[PDB]
Ligand binder design. Sequence first.
Ligand code: HEM
Ligand SMILES: [Ca+2]
Ligand SMILES: [Ca+2]
Ligand code: NA
Length: 306
Amino acid sequence: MQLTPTFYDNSCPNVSNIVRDTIVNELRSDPRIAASILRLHFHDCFVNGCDASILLDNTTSFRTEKDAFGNANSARGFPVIDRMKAAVESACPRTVSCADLLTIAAQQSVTLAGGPSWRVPLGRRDSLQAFLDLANANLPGPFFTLPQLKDSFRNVGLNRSSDLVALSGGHTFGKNQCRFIMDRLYNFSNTGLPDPTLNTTYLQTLRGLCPLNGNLSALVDFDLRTPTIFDNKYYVNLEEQKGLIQSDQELFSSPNATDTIPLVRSFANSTQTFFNAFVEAMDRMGNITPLTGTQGQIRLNCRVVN
Ligand code: HEM
Ligand SMILES: [Ca+2]
Ligand SMILES: [Ca+2]
Ligand code: NA
């Protein structure tokens, strides 16, 4: 069954409004939540598709994806998704899947942070199991080279360099732990030197935030220009060698970036160009192997199978 933006227009017409209200409320006390929620949807979609598999907690028969290398001590916002799910369940019982709830939450998060506004396709259903090993295999790492990032996106069904460059724009907001940039700052690829693709002035700033032998869990902003605003500044940073993690800077600096460089420039040059590409890529990501029709179920509690 094809996903459609009007899937809940009769069964739960105010689902998007309930989701939005939940996020607006949470943002007051946790300014990072819109970033966190967008990342949860990306981590959902990259592992068996956008089927809310990531929201499932551990069971004696399958491990939770929350213990994946890319999720443990990193992924967050789970209780906020529970809160919006409970509110939607109250408004429209057994109607909205957690997979769709999370997709709407990610879009509303992006809009609330100043990004584009659009209606996501809906009709996804919820998985009957979680996929820890697949999450370890499929979530890309910040130390990935550009060919590895491309392989990771293609592996899940996003073949286009625009998919990779536009979705990496999620790093226009949110936080990253020092842990993931220590090599870049002090010993990159066993070279014993910082990553030469990191702007030297920014290198100093980052070394001050993440000293050697310092708190690896300290958080740094992905976007030094507008840390919490969803905008195209992320690409302007890359052009100046100011991408935070290796995978960010690789889009502009890798020897394999002949195809991504023009996209980075185009998105730095025009907010509209970036926003259009982001919506298009988000919807392609949101279309990865959904369960639809009668497949899977509308989960009542996102943490457990019905
Ligand atoms: C291209 C490959 C990508 C890699 C290697 C990557 C890597 C990471 C890493 C290392 C973190 C920091 C985790 C932490 O410190 O706990 C992070 C955070 C984040 N990622 Fe990415 N990411 C990628 C793609 C994406 C995509 C496709 C999106 C969404 C469209 C996304 C959205 C975010 C956001 C918004 C955050 C901040 C989350 C928060 O502050 O809670 N990332 N990512
Ligand atoms: Ca999933
Ligand atoms: Ca920004
Ligand atoms: Na597709």
